Amino acid sequence: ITILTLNINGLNSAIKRHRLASWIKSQDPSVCCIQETHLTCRDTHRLKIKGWRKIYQANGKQKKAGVAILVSDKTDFKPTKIKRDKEGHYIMVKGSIQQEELTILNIYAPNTGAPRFIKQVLSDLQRDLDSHTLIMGDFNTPLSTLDRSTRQKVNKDTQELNSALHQADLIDIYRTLHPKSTEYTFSTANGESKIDHIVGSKALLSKCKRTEIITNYLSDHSAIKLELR
Ligand SMILES: [Mn+2]
């Protein structure tokens, strides 16, 4: 299967929804984690993509944040649990694909206090984390020195997040498969950073076949795609 993460930078326009649908069809992911749909909980019906009927969403009441997990019609996904943030910053979906269990946590961290935010979500969802977990999305933080063009060491709050990840036997899959990578998923006029991530259970590393970053015209973030046995 293929799993794809993208911060879409809003889906309140028909044109954005159309171009996203075309891009998804082309990429043909089994499961797609989207951040920043900007859809209100009253507007979630607006997200429909032919070929991806099962769409699980977490949304607040304003046109900000918002996350979705889309599952391909060709994927026989059998859900077992879905947990939605009432504020629209994360959604967890658990289930199986051909008798292989998978836990996916789609996260959009705020641009201030991100590593603290992510650490708190991990704590809140501690009982549902497992040895077949993927945590993906826009963490709004580096995880290691090479995740920023500046090469600054990550701060204390980020170190604390990394320790919490380590205690859960979670690793940065991208950086594990590509240790020397100086790729990025976000930029500004003066620098670049890899703030979008695929984190997962140590036990899933054996199933992780390939991962890559995908630049695109849709958003101010590049996507990350993972192929999983
Ligand atoms: Mn944004």
TrEMBL record:
Transmembrane segments: none
Name this polypeptide is given: RNA-directed DNA polymerase
Taxonomic path: Eukaryota, Metazoa, Chordata, Craniata, Vertebrata
